[PDB]
Amino acid sequence: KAGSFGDLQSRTSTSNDLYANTNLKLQRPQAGIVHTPFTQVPSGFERWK
Amino acid sequence: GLKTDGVDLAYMSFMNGKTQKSIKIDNLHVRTSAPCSLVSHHGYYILAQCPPGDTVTVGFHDGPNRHTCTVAHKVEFRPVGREKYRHPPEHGVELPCNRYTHKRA
Amino acid sequence: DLDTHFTQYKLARPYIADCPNCGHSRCDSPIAIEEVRGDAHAGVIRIQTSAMFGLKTDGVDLAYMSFMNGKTQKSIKIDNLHVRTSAPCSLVSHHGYYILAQCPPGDTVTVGFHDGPNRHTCTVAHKVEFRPVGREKYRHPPEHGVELPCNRYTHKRADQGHYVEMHQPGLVADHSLLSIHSAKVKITVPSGAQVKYYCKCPDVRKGITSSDHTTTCTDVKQCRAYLIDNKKWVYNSGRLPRGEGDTFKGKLHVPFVPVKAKC
Amino acid sequence: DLDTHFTQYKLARPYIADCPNCGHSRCDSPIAIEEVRGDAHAGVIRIQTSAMF
Amino acid sequence: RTCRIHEISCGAHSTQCIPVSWRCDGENDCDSGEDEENCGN
Amino acid sequence: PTCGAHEFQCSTSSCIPISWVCDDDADCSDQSDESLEQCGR
Amino acid sequence: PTCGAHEFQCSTSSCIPISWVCDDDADCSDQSDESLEQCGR
Amino acid sequence: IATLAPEPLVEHKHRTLILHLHPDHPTLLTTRSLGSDANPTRQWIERPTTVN
Amino acid sequence: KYKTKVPSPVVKCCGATQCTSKPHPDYQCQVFSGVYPFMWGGAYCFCDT
Ligand SMILES: [Ca+2]
Ligand SMILES: [Ca+2]
Ligand SMILES: [Ca+2]
Numbered sequence: 001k002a003g004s005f006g007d008l009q010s011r012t013s014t015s016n017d018l019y020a021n022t023n024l025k026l027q028r029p030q031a032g033i034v035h036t037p038f039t040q041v042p043s044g045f046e047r048w049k
Numbered sequence: 050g051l052k053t054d055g056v057d058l059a060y061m062s063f064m065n066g067k068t069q070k071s072i073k074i075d076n077l078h079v080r081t082s083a084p085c086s087l088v089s090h091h092g093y094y095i096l097a098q099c100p101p102g103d104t105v106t107v108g109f110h111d112g113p114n115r116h117t118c119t120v121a122h123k124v125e126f127r128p129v130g131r132e133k134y135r136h137p138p139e140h141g142v143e144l145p146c147n148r149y150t151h152k153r154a
Numbered sequence: 155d156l157d158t159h160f161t162q163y164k165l166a167r168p169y170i171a172d173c174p175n176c177g178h179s180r181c182d183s184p185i186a187i188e189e190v191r192g193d194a195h196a197g198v199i200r201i202q203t204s205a206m207f208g209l210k211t212d213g214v215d216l217a218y219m220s221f222m223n224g225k226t227q228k229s230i231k232i233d234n235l236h237v238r239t240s241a242p243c244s245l246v247s248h249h250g251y252y253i254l255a256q257c258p259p260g261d262t263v264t265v266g267f268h269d270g271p272n273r274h275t276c277t278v279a280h281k282v283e284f285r286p287v288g289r290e291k292y293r294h295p296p297e298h299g300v301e302l303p304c305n306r307y308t309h310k311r312a313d314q315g316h317y318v319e320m321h322q323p324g325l326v327a328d329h330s331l332l333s334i335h336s337a338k339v340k341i342t343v344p345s346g347a348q349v350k351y352y353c354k355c356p357d358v359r360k361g362i363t364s365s366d367h368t369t370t371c372t373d374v375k376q377c378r379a380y381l382i383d384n385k386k387w388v389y390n391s392g393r394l395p396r397g398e399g400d401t402f403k404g405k406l407h408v409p410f411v412p413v414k415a416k417c
Numbered sequence: 418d419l420d421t422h423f424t425q426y427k428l429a430r431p432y433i434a435d436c437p438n439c440g441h442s443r444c445d446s447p448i449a450i451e452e453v454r455g456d457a458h459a460g461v462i463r464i465q466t467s468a469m470f
Numbered sequence: 471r472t473c474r475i476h477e478i479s480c481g482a483h484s485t486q487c488i489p490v491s492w493r494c495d496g497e498n499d500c501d502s503g504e505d506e507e508n509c510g511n
Numbered sequence: 512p513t514c515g516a517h518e519f520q521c522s523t524s525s526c527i528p529i530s531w532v533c534d535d536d537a538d539c540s541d542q543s544d545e546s547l548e549q550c551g552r
Numbered sequence: 553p554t555c556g557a558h559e560f561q562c563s564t565s566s567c568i569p570i571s572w573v574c575d576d577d578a579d580c581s582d583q584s585d586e587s588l589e590q591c592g593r
Numbered sequence: 594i595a596t597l598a599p600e601p602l603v604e605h606k607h608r609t610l611i612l613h614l615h616p617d618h619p620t621l622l623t624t625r626s627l628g629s630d631a632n633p634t635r636q637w638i639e640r641p642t643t644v645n
Numbered sequence: 646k647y648k649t650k651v652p653s654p655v656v657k658c659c660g661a662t663q664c665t666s667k668p669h670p671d672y673q674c675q676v677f678s679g680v681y682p683f684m685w686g687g688a689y690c691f692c693d694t
Pocket of ligand 2: 532
């Protein structure tokens, strides 16, 4: 649910398959500079702590 | 910006007694709670971008002297919009605000 | 040895990228804060910049740093390299792109270094907080206290199984190498630079040259110029344009990895 | 006289005692902050150290 | 048209000539978009 | 007690890797990795 | 875009006063008021 | 330049809108209805919450 | 806790570019048209708007 506990789920600590839905949305760069902005909800594991 | 002989933006002048001294700006510091980064100076006025706090103090080194003056004025941070941020972001929404001008005119 | 860690960091160069609030008007700075990590248990943080610390043109020396002003990679002795958040932090170590410091809580992260009379400051807006260990919310680590397991960033540079990738730099645009010879613009190509160009003076006149190539057009404002330096690599920032073709997946260790310690 | 306030202070010397957090790792330093006193009414404090001024 | 044998015309509207090597480069050079098509796979 | 081939053993059964010796650091409690018999300073 | 007798036009409808010309500040994106030829420096 | 909040999570129901909001700064949410009476609400959201 | 990494953007700035769908957790693509960036040492490319 992107904000509570399963924003990032991994079967093992060294596993290669990752589940991740963090509502990552890209944003338009402004005023003629090269940078990549984005907006996303914070980590629910940090919120669960 | 004046050195008692013309116009030069790297110079300042003051009085120590009845003699109007003139030096070069070596360490002109403005701090509130953290050191601010000043923008411009013209005559009696200094423009600076300061963090919030309860005191405003400026100073300049003449020789080995200090020359500090600390006034007690409460300065806050005023965000624009419907979110209360504490430092202006890298990216977001351009919104109209009201700020002091960079230019001297 | 020092060069065992510094082996793959000799193969990379600093870069100039976008920094908000560098002075007062978000210029491009030689030192640019990207990805400051602040989730340790004593207020210690690890800051990654664009400059290179502890690396000369020849050998390695822990008091010398390297940065760029244009296209010339300039080395300078570290004299006043300061990191501050709301009070001046006390830095711990530096290796390559990365600085380590122990900071009080605040909302900004500021770095800077003097070379002559220059300042070279950068200020990013990252909320860094002090996280105590245990069931008491203290505000500074005490003289005497019960030992508890805290996770911190380590003091020593080593491989430790954490990697970042470097990449071949893309085209860097320089306008100071385009000058008019008599009435026609001329390209100055220094030391195998492979300078690209793109003219639209009556039409397209694109091409790649290696020396001279006096362009037969009039104005310097109607022709762009680039620069292809592939000798040294850079970390693929989000603030740099990518290369044209395939770019190799390099490797570079992170020096101050998170470990588990006692607080 | 200025010398009257230093008659018993000439017989004393500085010393090196430990203090936490010089840099990062709790040094032994000539400056060692002992007994900070802050019970005044305008934020003026008195700091006793190991050095001699 | 009627260019040299080392160059190929583009567009066939204004009779403008380009070298052959500028094929599928990703840049819209001519007025017509025939120069970015029929490139190699 | 013997460690692996990629570990340098200072004293008291604690060993550090070969990449960690002669590098101006205290990775052992006895400072054998920066002694005069190994680095030769 | 013809401006008045007390305004200086940089390029493409951008007018600033005459006191803003050659004063070590770029008030125009054309930067014509602080150019090499207009300032004479 | 002002900040932009993270996008809320919309969950629908029978005549009910459920919003899960995870702000990073104290952020204002004001609603109204487009009928004869607007019935306005106004609150500042500091913590991750949920409103119906 | 996650860590979102951003690759370097491509600036093909006379024309247009498209992406495939790489297999990555919460992968994002976008194309922004008519940016005209400004690096150090002048603007990046000639093609306006
Ligand atoms: Ca072509
Ligand atoms: Ca060692
Ligand atoms: Ca001006």
